[PDB]
Ligand binder design. Sequence first.
Ligand SMILES: Cc1cc2nc3c(=O)[nH]c(=O)nc-3n(C[C@H](O)[C@H](O)[C@H](O)COP(=O)(O)OP(=O)(O)OC[C@H]3O[C@@H](n4cnc5c(N)ncnc54)[C@H](O)[C@@H]3O)c2cc1C
Ligand SMILES: Cc1cc2nc3c(=O)[nH]c(=O)nc-3n(C[C@H](O)[C@H](O)[C@H](O)COP(=O)(O)OP(=O)(O)OC[C@H]3O[C@@H](n4cnc5c(N)ncnc54)[C@H](O)[C@@H]3O)c2cc1C
Ligand SMILES: CN1C[C@@H](O)C2=CC(=O)C(=O)C=C21
Ligand SMILES: CN1C[C@@H](O)C2=CC(=O)C(=O)C=C21
Ligand SMILES: [Zn+2]
Ligand SMILES: [Zn+2]
Lengths: 230, 230
Amino acid sequence: AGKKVLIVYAHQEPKSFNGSLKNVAVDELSRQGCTVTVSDLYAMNFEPRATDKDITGTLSNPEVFNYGVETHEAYKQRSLASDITDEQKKVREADLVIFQFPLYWFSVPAILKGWMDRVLCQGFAFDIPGFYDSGLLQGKLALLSVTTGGTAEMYTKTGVNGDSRYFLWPLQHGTLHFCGFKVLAPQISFAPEIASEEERKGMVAAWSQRLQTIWKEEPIPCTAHWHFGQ
Amino acid sequence: AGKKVLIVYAHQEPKSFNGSLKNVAVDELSRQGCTVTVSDLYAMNFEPRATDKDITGTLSNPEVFNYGVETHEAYKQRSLASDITDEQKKVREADLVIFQFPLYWFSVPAILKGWMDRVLCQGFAFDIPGFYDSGLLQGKLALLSVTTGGTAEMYTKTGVNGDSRYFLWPLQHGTLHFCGFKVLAPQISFAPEIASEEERKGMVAAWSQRLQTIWKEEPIPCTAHWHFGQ
Ligand SMILES: Cc1cc2nc3c(=O)[nH]c(=O)nc-3n(C[C@H](O)[C@H](O)[C@H](O)COP(=O)(O)OP(=O)(O)OC[C@H]3O[C@@H](n4cnc5c(N)ncnc54)[C@H](O)[C@@H]3O)c2cc1C
Ligand SMILES: Cc1cc2nc3c(=O)[nH]c(=O)nc-3n(C[C@H](O)[C@H](O)[C@H](O)COP(=O)(O)OP(=O)(O)OC[C@H]3O[C@@H](n4cnc5c(N)ncnc54)[C@H](O)[C@@H]3O)c2cc1C
Ligand SMILES: CN1C[C@@H](O)C2=CC(=O)C(=O)C=C21
Ligand SMILES: CN1C[C@@H](O)C2=CC(=O)C(=O)C=C21
Ligand SMILES: [Zn+2]
Ligand SMILES: [Zn+2]
């Protein structure tokens, strides 16, 4: 019954364009009766570093630290840091995970990258036995809501930065799809700083308009063809 | 003449394959008479998060905080956090910058992504205009030395992960080249964890061997065709 939604927000300013898109997602999804949880990473001062402090108690090898094996063991032994576990709890219960963030070097901001590095550990998000279409998070929907600095023009197959689908690869396919996520079509708000009040008001409008039928949307075919192909 | 190289290291275990590759570069370049410097991010507990704490002076817009704008203005006014300016000092005098890290979700670890987000600020690494071939860091060489869990086979066009050059796009083009860096062919040491004891020694030997003639190398054609083809 009903749907649960987690929004991983990554911006320092509540009055930013990102903040508005995030508030619009909450308003709409909340008006729809959906269950909404938000992770304000900056506000939570979320630990981005993948260290040995992510494992509580004794390590399975205090001689040579291997973050990948340690977390897998910590997860299976329920001994991960509480901040990491608190997040996995939200992801486990979610039906739709929305990532709201400004583009930082063709990728997500470091605080957001830390999230994925620490929260999506082996055993919870994936495992040798099953990744991609066999990820441990299959059945869940993922969506990237990103804002850029460069104009949509610059993000064309013949533009300077190249086609936006290029930088989406490491995120949609390499991460989301890898964990079994049904990646939805990204929502990109091109150069909101450059745009005007009219244009900006219009961007946030399309965001909310789309949020009315996201449960109706079809998962994007996360393939090498979709991103780079033609 | 002499040369200065900066290795931005990002691994927690000094005994890891990455740590070995890092000590190797340090030994080889150093043997050649080169000026080397290592930025062991984890050992420095490097701040990955981009926040208002990176600016010391008065904020241009104390009402709405904008990291990009604030760090640009702070850089010109010399009001950036010392940990940030200390890194820019290293990059500035560097002829070659090598990034030593294990692949994390088709990208760099959060701690290393934070370095790119905070260190390569507007005014220092690039300007608008003044990016890509016009980058402020033009005349410098940059190299990505990545180690992964996946195998070379998995990282092929028809592989489960796609060609390894795909995930190198945001980093080589979107980041380094954007900053004016001449990108040298990446050094990828595939699945050293699965490789045999001899194959591991083989991957290390190939590293130090390539470094012996690194200065005679030429940058790759950092273009969409080089990465994807088409
Ligand atoms: C370290 C770093 C790396 C970066 N890397 C890249 C990169 O690789 N590629 C790239 O393209 N860009 C990059 N950028 C730029 C970045 O993507 C943009 O600055 C950012 O996405 C702008 O979004 P914002 O939310 O910060 O904008 P804002 O600063 O919020 O500006 C947008 C405008 O929206 C207005 N606004 C707020 N709420 C509303 C509302 N409800 N209705 C109408 N208007 C509203 C604001 O007041 C403001 O004037 C980078 C920036 C930094 C700091
Ligand atoms: C959060 C997270 C996300 C990840 N995402 C991805 C991803 O998207 N794609 C992907 O492919 N992988 C991914 N990985 C896996 C990661 O890239 C590999 O685990 C890592 O690159 C292995 O390098 P290492 O230095 O950590 O190995 P090590 O743990 O050091 O193991 C390699 C072996 O090398 C041996 N060794 C070290 N030095 C020497 C030497 N001098 N001579 C001989 N043998 C030596 C070691 O003792 C060890 O047995 C991820 C891992 C984590 C933790
Ligand atoms: C801060 N800012 C404004 C925006 O124009 C922009 C584009 C980039 O590619 C980048 O690295 C930084 C940017
Ligand atoms: C630790 N490990 C094993 C290696 O096979 C691997 C590939 C990934 O894509 C990933 O996220 C984690 C991995
Ligand atoms: Zn995919
Ligand atoms: Zn390029």
